Enzyme design. Structure first.
Site, PDB file in Angstrom:
ATOM      1  N   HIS A  16      -0.944  26.104  -3.269  1.00 53.97           N
ATOM      2  CA  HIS A  16      -0.848  27.284  -2.422  1.00 53.97           C
ATOM      3  C   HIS A  16       0.145  26.952  -1.339  1.00 53.97           C
ATOM      4  CE1 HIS A  16      -2.400  29.328   1.431  1.00 53.97           C
ATOM      5  NE2 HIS A  16      -1.685  30.268   0.771  1.00 53.97           N
ATOM      6  N   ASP A  17       1.103  27.846  -1.130  1.00 53.48           N
ATOM      7  CA  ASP A  17       2.250  27.543  -0.237  1.00 53.48           C
ATOM      8  C   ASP A  17       2.833  26.154  -0.470  1.00 53.48           C
ATOM      9  OD1 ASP A  17       2.831  29.903   1.131  1.00 53.48           O
ATOM     10  OD2 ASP A  17       1.175  29.707   2.558  1.00 53.48           O
ATOM     11  N   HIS A  51       5.823  29.814   5.519  1.00 55.71           N
ATOM     12  CA  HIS A  51       4.400  30.217   5.604  1.00 55.71           C
ATOM     13  C   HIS A  51       4.322  31.350   6.622  1.00 55.71           C
ATOM     14  CE1 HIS A  51      -0.058  29.617   5.546  1.00 55.71           C
ATOM     15  NE2 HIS A  51       0.079  30.265   6.712  1.00 55.71           N
ATOM     16  N   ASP A  95      -5.040  24.237  -2.058  1.00 60.52           N
ATOM     17  CA  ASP A  95      -4.410  23.514  -0.946  1.00 60.52           C
ATOM     18  C   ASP A  95      -4.564  22.002  -1.153  1.00 60.52           C
ATOM     19  OD1 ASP A  95      -3.646  25.837   0.388  1.00 60.52           O
ATOM     20  OD2 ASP A  95      -5.278  25.663   1.874  1.00 60.52           O
ATOM     21  N   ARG A 136       6.681  31.413  -1.069  1.00 59.75           N
ATOM     22  CA  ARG A 136       6.831  32.631  -0.294  1.00 59.75           C
ATOM     23  C   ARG A 136       8.002  32.383   0.640  1.00 59.75           C
ATOM     24  NH1 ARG A 136       0.453  34.336   0.225  1.00 59.75           N
ATOM     25  NH2 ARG A 136      -0.179  33.107  -1.606  1.00 59.75           N
TER      26      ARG A 136
END
Ligand SMILES: [Cl-]
Length: 303
Positions: free
Chosen positions: A29-30, A79, A280, A66
């Site tokens: 995630h990210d 982020h 994460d 992103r």
């Protein structure tokens, strides 16, 4: 040796006749937030500590990028408002390198706009991605460009498969690559048809849950995948959760409870379908706890 003992090339060990949707894939995630060093800012904006190549080496295949349009020809990894100190070219080169070295793995790359474009930008984020990345001759052959809506591992391996969170696109290959894009509901569990109705996307992205409700939302979707053998269904299950409110109420903090907890559950389930689980601190280990990435990897069957 079980699949997780060689996480750098675990996809090479599977049957490449499978659709990627049927594979149990670990995600980060990210993905690009491993660059953050500011301790105050990292509490809420940092979600990883391993670079792209190390994540790939530890077996991550779904990357959540992103970004922000920072020039008409440039996308910066972010982020939300926080700039992650590199541009998308960087992730693309690392991926290409990795895929060159391990040619029987596929990477799924999620692309989302996370923050308003620089005031000098005159083009849409989608247009900049399409023209300066996807169609850039520099990254020729790097992307999956097939017309299959449900691509198999054989036809994508060696390549990046676009997972389109940009909205409508004139790009034609990968998940949500049509002028409708993916209808994503905010902070929710949801289902939506993508690719001109060919696929049924099932998402748990309740990113503001408190951890206890998060486990329950992760488990609920996990238990749906388990008894679903439909290859036209694709599961995306985000473990990750936003920061709570104080220092050391960090995303890390929650992940350190969520990951071992979910990893435990998957292991007790043996070789069940899990879907794509996006975490994460991928590859972060705690002495005495199951490892989420390893357990996702080992949940895949080998026939
Ligand atoms: Cl920083």
């Amino acid at each position: 040796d079980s699949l997780s003992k060689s996480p750098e090339n675990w996809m090479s060990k599977l049957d490449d006749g499978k659709h990627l949707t049927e594979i149990n894939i670990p995600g980060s995630h990210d993905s690009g937030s491993f660059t953050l060093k500011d301790p105050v800012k990292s509490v809420w904006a940092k979600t990883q500590d391993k670079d792209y190549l190390t994540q790939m080496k530890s077996g991550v295949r779904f990357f959540d990028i992103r970004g922000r349009a920072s020039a008409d020809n440039m996308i910066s990894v972010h982020h939300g408002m926080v700039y992650l100190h590199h541009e998308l070219g960087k992730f693309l080169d690392d991926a290409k390198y990795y895929l060159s070295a391990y040619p029987n793995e596929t990477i799924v790359m999620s692309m989302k706009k996370d923050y308003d474009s620089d005031s000098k930008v005159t083009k849409t984020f989608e247009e900049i991605f399409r023209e300066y990345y996807y169609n850039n001759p520099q990254y020729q052959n790097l992307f999956y460009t097939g017309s299959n809506a449900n691509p198999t591992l054989k036809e994508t391996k060696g390549k990046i498969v676009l997972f389109n969170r940009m909205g409508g696109t004139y790009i034609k290959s990968g998940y949500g690559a049509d002028t409708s894009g993916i209808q994503w509901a905010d902070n929710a569990t949801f289902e939506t048809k993508i690719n001109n109705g060919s696929l049924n996307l099932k998402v748990q992205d309740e990113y503001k849950d408190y951890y206890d409700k998060k486990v329950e939302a992760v488990k609920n979707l996990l238990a749906k995948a388990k008894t679903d053998s439909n290859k036209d269904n694709v599961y995306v299950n985000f473990l990750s959760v936003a920061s709570g409110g104080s220092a050391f109420n960090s995303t890390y903090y929650y992940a350190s409870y969520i990951n071992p907890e979910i990893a435990k559950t998957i292991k007790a389930n043996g070789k069940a379908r899990t879907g794509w689980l996006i975490v994460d601190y991928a590859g972060y280990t705690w002495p005495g706890y199951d490892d989420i990435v390893s357990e996702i990897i080992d949940s895949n069957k080998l026939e």
